[PDB]
RNA sequence: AUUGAAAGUUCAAAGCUUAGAUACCCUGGAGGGAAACCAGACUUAACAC
């Protein structure tokens, strides 16, 4: 098929979570989450792409090369990357 | 009375064919919901003398 894998998870805040969408004039509070285009939050996918591919890049310092081959190359890409993330859509929010 | 006179560079003909504005890219870094502020002010009235 299109894709060789196609792996799924859910995002548990730990903490509290900050991603923004940084300081828009119809805005009222000058660094809110990031929404989407319904009004939930949500962590696009570029978000979610630079902080795993950092966080990977920096844990598994044997491995970036099988980290680059699939999250892309950071400089002079040959080719794209293999690896997609989607949007991630709000599951369920504590009220 | 001229090495002259006369004689249409004309006819037919598709700038077309194949071709992904794509690849890599964290709205992040820095920033004390603080600063000021008395739970206080005062007894008065009545009649008796």
Redesign the pocket.
């Known amino acids: 098929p299109y894709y060789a894998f196609a792996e799924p998870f859910f995002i548990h805040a730990i903490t509290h979570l ?6 828009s004039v119809e805005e009222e509070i000058a ?1 809110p989450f ?1 929404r989407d285009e319904l009004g939930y939050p949500t962590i ?1 996918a ?6 795993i ?3 990977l890049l920096k844990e598994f310092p044997d491995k970036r090369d099988v980290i680059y081959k699939v ?5 002079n ?5 293999l690896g997609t993330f989607l949007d991630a859509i709000l599951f369920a929010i504590p009220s």
């Open positions: 900050h991603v923004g969408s940084g300081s660094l990031q696009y570029s978000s979610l792409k630079g902080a591919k950092s966080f999250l892309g190359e950071d400089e890409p040959e080719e794209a990357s």
